[PDB]
Structures are given as structure tokens and as C-alpha cells.
């Protein structure tokens, strides 16, 4: 009936060879804040992370090795009505 993930959609919208900008359609739940993780696909290079406030619907990642496959994941944390912890959404981009 409904798409279950944290944000329902996730895309990249502008991109330079060393940085991306991501947008997710604005959530119907009340998100306290999101985590954003990106890492080289298959690597044992550890994963990079930062937070964005629930306010926002986009962040920029930078410092990307240009042509490599990055796995980008967005997590959300909800407490407003009750605690939620929705399952996240990922995409793969190479720049």
C-alpha cells in the first residue's frame, strides 16, 4: 500500500566530479534528524557519515574519488508521536 522506507525516494540532482547533492521527497512523518552515509562499494575503506536536521530535504557529500562506485544511504530517526526508526533507503552513484 505504502512505500515503507525512511525517505520514500532518493536522487542525485547536481554533481561535480568530486561532490554530489541529494534530494529526498519531504517526509510525511516528523523526522528528528537524518544520518547520511557514503562508502566505496565493496571496499573495506570504512564508511563516512554525517547528520542533517529533520528540517532539511537535501545534503551535499564531497571528497569523492571521481569515477568510483559510492553506495549512499539515508537513515531517519522519528520520535514525535512515538519512537519509529524506519528502515533506510540506498542508491549507488559513481561520479
Amino acid at each position: 500500500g505504502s512505500v515503507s522506507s525512511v525517505p520514500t525516494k532518493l536522487e542525485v540532482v547536481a554533481a561535480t566530479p568530486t561532490s554530489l547533492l541529494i534530494s529526498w521527497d519531504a517526509p510525511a512523518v516528523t523526522v528528528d534528524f537524518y544520518h547520511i552515509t557514503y562508502g566505496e562499494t565493496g571496499g573495506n575503506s570504512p564508511v563516512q557519515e554525517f547528520t542533517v536536521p529533520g528540517s532539511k530535504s537535501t545534503a551535499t557529500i564531497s571528497g569523492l574519488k571521481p569515477g568510483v562506485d559510492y553506495t549512499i544511504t539515508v537513515y531517519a530517526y522519528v520520535s514525535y508521536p512515538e519512537y519509529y526508526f524506519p528502515s533506510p533507503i540506498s542508491i549507488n552513484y559513481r561520479t
Binding site: 528528528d32 534528524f33 544520518h35 552515509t37 557519515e49 554525517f50 547528520t51 542533517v52 536536521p53 537513515y75 530517526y77 520520535s79 512515538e82 519512537y83 519509529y84 526508526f85
Partner: protein
């Protein structure tokens, strides 16, 4: 004297206790855990919020919110366990409560019936109170933890909460349990009775003071002076109670148990289809208690009671009480006498012997009993199985005389209580005897010997004596004298009657009896104590 059924109960109650003690500690743990979660989430949010003010987007690690998501999962697994252990407890407690209410308590409600009509009085509701209280404290503890879960849920919840889904039935269950256990613990301890006729409970004459007492077997001090009992009669021929009509349960007993005694009650008829000594009424006692937020209506009632205009009606009334309580155990059957059941002699015999053990040292022998069998049934021996109608026992007259069986006997007992009680005790009155055994018995012994028995000729009930003259054919004839009634015995004691008694056989006055009481006994020895001047 403790049965095995009871020492097992005693164990179930201690098992229920420790079960709830364990849950109470399991919830300090599940409370700790959700506090830990909630605290950490908010601290890590005001921090992943406030330091975003100053530019910083790397304060709160994903590791620490995988660790938080995981401790939410843990406590849901614990909430899950707890709510099913709780329902597990509730089932244990529903079982223990049947075995209290439907067995051990119903056994007392009955032993009480037997006690009322003369039987061994088992009563002592003490050990029954301790079991009910032990289970009610357990249930209260349990109530507090099921409210505890409501508290936890407001604080911390989520889409699948085991509490949102299962608690509502856990509450429903523990409330029905507690409400029902309190309604069952509200019992009439001493059944209504006019103080001047103690042997005749459940018969109330109008305009006479009677008394009754209720107990509540949940020994919770929270409830002292908190419950006002309103007594009445015939709640929806018909009556009212007058006097002091509300009383407030206190614990100044006995064992500091929650009682409330009504003295100061009388009945008045108000302004009609079954004869009055068979028309039954209930005296109901109502109160309400508010306990830690729970309203709990209470209502118990007396055993059915016969209500009468005049004291001449009491033998028929008591008959009705004997017939009711001997035969049913339903406490609220007002319409019992529209289709009375039948009783076996083997039950009726024990009740009659009780009307004489209840009131005197002796009770009735098997010779005495078997001759009363002949009065109810007709001739025979070993009546064990024979059955007895309400009509044979009181409603219809007997053996072509003008009166009931029961009325004859009530009046005889009344006579043995108030006059000649000393002679009944100690067995100088062989009261119930066939004329043929009266003869066969005395034939054996010398011609002066004599015997004391009750009249069969009068509703009123009197006593007489019988001796044996012997004749020229060699046969033994009996003589009995016109029996001495309540009206003769006000002016002389029966024993004094016996010493002084003489008869005129030709000429002059000999002492007919004044020689021996049945078994070889000089007369002075047997009634010398009552001569006095």
C-alpha cells in the same frame, strides 16, 4: 485440621505470591531499560541539534544509533515476555479463586446452613479470611504492575507495542478477578435472629428486635471505617426494616477483622399468595468501595427467612427453615415452597437428633428415632431409604390427630427446655416409645417400676408416666396417667409431682409409681434432688 486440598491451596497462594514478586522486579529492569533508551535518545538529539547551531554535523555517530535501535528491540522483547508472564499469572490466579470461591468458601456457606439448624458449628471464618486476603494482596500487587505498564507506554511506545495491544485485556482480567473476589468475601457471618429465640435463626417476628452481622474477608486496613453497609429487606407480601439501618465496618473485633454488627432492627409489614410460614424473604446488605480508583459494588444477602405475626406461628416457621436448609444449598430460593422437595429419613433423623443436641445435653437414640419413624411413615423397621414429604412432616396432620408431626415435636422440645430439662439431661426421660415395647420392657421388671414418656394426644406437648399392674390370667397391663402439660407444671415441678403421686384402688390412696424408675432404681435416688422442702 487441614485437608490436602487446603495445604495445596496454601501452596498455590505462596506460589502466586512469589510469582508476582518476581514480576515486580522484572519491571524495575524493563523500566530501567526504557529510561536508558529515552534518556540517550534525547541527550543525543539535543546534542545532534544544538551543535548543528555552531556548524557541526559529526557529533552523533551512526554506531550510537544502531546501539539505540538495538536497545529498543531488547526492551520490546522484554515487554513481550512480561506481558505473557502476566497473563500467565492471571490464569494461575483465576484457578486459585475458583478453588476458593466455588469450593472452600461454598463449603463454609454450607457448614453455616447446617450450624443454623442445629449441626456441629464449623464456622471460624479466620483461616478462610487469611487465604482470601493472601490472594487479594497478590492481585493488588498485580494491579499495580498492570498500571505500571500504562505508565511505561505513555513514556515510550512504537508501532508494535506489546502493551498497547495486550494490556487492555490484562486490565479487564485483573479487575474482574478483584471485583469478584471482594463480592465473594462479603458474607453474612451471623444470620438474622431475634435475640430472645436464639435457637430459631431465620425466623423474625414483626416488631421484635433482631440482629445480624456481616464480615468482609479482605483484611485491608485501607478499608477501615470506609464502607457503610445499608441493610434492607425485599429489594427489587412485603416488609420494611426499622431502626438503625446503616452501620460502618470497623476492625475493633476477635482478630481485628473487618466486621459490622447490626443490632437494632425490627420488621413492619407494608400494604400476597403463599401461606406465611412458607413465604420466604431475603435481608440484603449493600455497600460500595472505592479502592485505588476502582469502584466495586457489594451485595450479599441472608439465608431466606420466615416472617411471622405471632409467636404461635413459630413451630411452622422453623419447620420451613429446617426443610429448606436440610435439603437445598441455594441461598436465594424464595419460591422453594411452591414445589418443595422430598427428603430421606436418613437425613431427617440426623436433623431431629440435632433439635435435641442443639438445645440440651442428649440428642435422640435409635429406639427414640425409630418410634418417630413410625409416626411419619407407618409401621416397619430399618427405614434407611424411606422417603418423607413436606406434607408428612409439617403441612398435613398425622395419624388421625388434629396436628402436624413437627408442631407436636417443637412443642415437646419447648416443654423439655423450660420444665423438666434436668431430667432429660442424664436420661431419666425415655421419651419416645411404642406402647408394645413400653409393655414388653416393664413386664421383665417388678410391678412398681415405671417410665416417663411424652403425650401423643395434644399439639401442646406434655409428659406422663406409665407403670405395670399384673393380673390373674398372669398378663401384665399398663396404666398411664393423663399427661402433665405446661399449664400443670407452672405450679409444681414434674419431679415433685412424682413423689407426691398416689391413686385410690379400693378404699385408700397407695403410691402407684413411687417405687422404681425403669432400670432398677430407687425412686428417691432419681428425684430426691428436686424435693427440697
Amino acid at each position: 485440621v487441614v485437608t490436602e486440598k487446603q495445604q495445596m491451596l496454601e501452596q498455590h497462594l505462596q506460589d502466586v505470591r512469589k510469582r508476582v514478586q518476581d514480576l515486580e522486579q522484572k519491571m524495575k529492569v524493563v523500566e530501567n531499560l526504557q529510561d536508558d533508551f529515552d534518556f540517550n535518545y534525547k541527550t543525543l538529539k539535543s546534542q545532534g541539534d544544538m551543535q548543528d547551531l555552531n556548524g557541526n554535523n559529526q557529533s552523533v555517530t551512526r554506531q550510537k544509533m544502531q546501539q539505540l535501535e538495538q536497545m529498543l528491540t531488547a526492551l520490546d522483547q522484554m515487554r513481550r515476555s512480561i506481558v505473557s508472564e502476566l497473563a500467565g499469572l492471571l490464569s494461575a490466579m483465576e484457578y486459585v479463586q475458583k478453588t476458593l470461591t466455588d469450593e472452600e468458601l461454598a463449603d463454609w456457606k454450607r457448614r453455616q446452613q447446617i450450624a443454623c439448624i442445629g449441626g456441629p458449628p464449623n464456622i471460624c471464618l479466620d483461616r478462610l479470611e487469611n487465604w482470601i486476603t493472601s490472594l487479594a494482596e497478590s492481585q493488588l500487587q498485580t494491579r499495580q504492575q498492570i498500571k505500571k505498564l500504562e505508565e511505561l507506554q505513555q513514556k515510550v511506545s512504537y508501532k508494535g507495542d506489546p502493551i498497547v495491544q495486550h494490556r487492555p485485556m490484562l486490565e479487564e482480567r485483573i479487575v474482574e478477578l478483584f471485583r469478584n473476589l471482594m463480592k465473594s468475601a462479603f458474607v453474612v457471618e451471623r444470620q438474622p435472629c431475634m435475640p430472645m429465640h436464639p435457637d430459631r435463626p431465620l425466623v423474625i417476628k414483626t416488631g421484635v428486635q433482631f440482629t445480624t452481622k456481616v464480615r468482609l474477608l479482605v483484611k485491608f486496613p485501607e478499608l477501615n471505617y470506609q464502607l457503610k453497609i445499608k441493610v434492607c429487606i425485599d429489594k427489587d407480601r412485603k416488609f420494611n426494616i426499622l431502626g438503625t439501618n446503616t452501620k460502618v465496618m470497623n476492625m475493633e473485633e476477635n482478630n481485628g477483622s473487618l466486621s459490622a454488627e447490626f443490632k437494632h432492627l425490627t420488621l413492619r409489614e407494608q400494604r400476597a399468595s403463599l401461606i406465611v410460614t412458607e413465604e420466604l424473604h431475603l435481608i440484603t446488605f449493600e455497600t460500595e468501595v472505592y479502592h485505588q480508583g476502582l469502584k466495586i459494588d457489594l451485595e450479599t444477602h441472608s439465608l431466606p427467612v420466615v416472617v411471622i405475626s405471632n409467636i404461635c406461628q413459630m413451630p411452622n416457621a422453623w419447620a420451613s427453615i429446617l426443610w429448606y436448609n436440610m435439603l437445598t444449598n441455594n441461598p436465594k430460593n424464595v419460591n422453594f415452597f411452591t414445589k418443595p422437595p422430598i427428603g430421606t429419613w436418613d437425613q431427617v433423623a440426623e436433623v431431629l437428633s440435632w433439635q435435641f443436641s442443639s438445645t440440651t445435653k442428649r440428642g435422640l437414640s435409635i429406639e427414640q428415632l425409630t418410634t418417630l419413624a413410625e409416626k411419619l411413615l407407618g409401621p416397619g423397621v430399618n427405614y434407611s431409604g424411606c422417603q418423607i414429604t413436606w406434607a408428612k412432616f409439617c403441612k398435613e396432620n398425622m395419624a388421625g390427630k388434629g396436628f402436624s408431626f413437627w408442631v407436636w415435636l417443637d412443642n415437646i422440645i419447648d416443654l423439655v427446655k423450660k420444665y423438666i430439662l434436668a431430667l432429660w439431661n442424664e436420661g431419666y426421660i425415655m421419651g419416645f416409645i411404642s406402647k408394645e415395647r413400653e409393655r414388653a420392657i416393664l413386664s421383665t421388671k417388678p410391678p412398681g417400676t415405671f417410665l416417663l414418656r411424652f403425650s401423643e394426644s395434644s399439639k401442646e406437648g406434655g409428659v406422663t408416666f406409665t407403670w405395670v399392674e399384673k393380673d390373674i390370667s398372669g398378663k401384665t397391663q399398663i396404666q398411664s396417667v393423663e399427661p402433665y402439660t405446661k399449664q400443670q407444671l407452672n405450679n409444681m415441678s414434674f419431679a415433685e409431682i412424682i413423689m407426691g403421686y398416689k391413686i385410690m384402688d379400693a378404699t385408700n390412696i397407695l403410691v402407684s409409681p413411687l417405687v422404681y424408675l425403669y432400670p432398677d432404681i430407687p425412686k428417691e435416688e432419681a428425684f430426691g434432688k428436686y424435693c427440697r422442702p
